[PDB]
């Protein structure tokens with residue numbers, strides 16, 4: 001095998017998607033070309049993405065979609081040519097969005113469908129809305145997730161409800177949607193940083209493509225720790241993450257990443273790798289990799305993507 005660089009693109013769509021891509025920029029996600037997409041023209045113009053694109057100006061005059069998914073879709077199908085060339089020749093496209101709105105919910109299945117005809121491995125990373133946003137938002141989101149899982153290879157759904165504790169005690173509204181911005185970041189960063197920033201144990205691109213092709217919907221767990229025993233306290237928190245909905249024991253596909261400085265020893269790596277093979281189904285397919293980040297200092301971060309129940 002000669003050397004090969006995987007070209008990876010991360011497209012946020014809708015306000016929620018673009019706000020999260022903004023958080024990826026600020027925290028320095030790399031190896032990836034960012035792409036913001038919205039109908040709100042005002043919201044696009046402070047996206048810090050390398051590529052922006054408004055959809056169906058005639059349809060909206062640049063106002064949004066008014067919480068109506070079926071026009072959020074039509075705006076994207078009539079930018080299909082602009083999208084298909086923004087993504088020409090990618091090996092992996094990740095679609096981010098908060099689900100429940102109009103453009104994200106409606107547009108995301110279209111982006112993902114385009115990336116999958118282009119032969120790219122297409123992974124969706126989305127949130128379920130908070131319960132306090134009403135039932136119409138929850139119904140519309142559940143219709144977008146159904147639409148999108150049929151246009152993806154893997155769809156990671158994150159329940160915002162379980163961020164609320166697992167967060168702070170006295171959270172605020174602004175804080176809550178900030179938390180959801182970092183979770184989406186943890187979702188795509190958990191995946192891409194295996195390809196683009198491998199550590200001691202490096203997974204190739206085609207191992208990721210193997211477990212994640214046709215995987216259906218998936219969930220995620222995160223955890224972090226410092227000190228001695230850091231690697232398996234973090235891996236413990238990841239297996240028991242509210243975000244994972246205790247779905248670990250019965251998952252047939254699992255992609256795990258452990259992130260740490262170059263100070264990360266083989267022994268730490270091995271105990272965390274063992275604790276997740278133990279907590280997984282015995283017939284489960286597990287692919288696992290180390291990630292190098294000298295900026296976390298003492299902290300170790302574990303991330304678990306579980307698919308196919």
Ligand SMILES: Nc1nc2c(ncn2[C@@H]2O[C@H](COP(=O)(O)OP(=O)(O)OP(=O)(O)O)[C@@H](O)[C@H]2O)c(=O)[nH]1
Nearest residue numbers: 014015016019065066098100101102103104129180
């Ligand atoms: N991660 C993240 N999610 C958000 C944010 N704001 C809202 N959301 C979630 O995303 C869902 C809908 O996404 P929005 O961006 O608000 O709606 P949209 O996709 O832009 O569609 P429009 O309503 O037509 O603008 C909401 O129900 C929230 O649960 C945010 O700032 N960050």
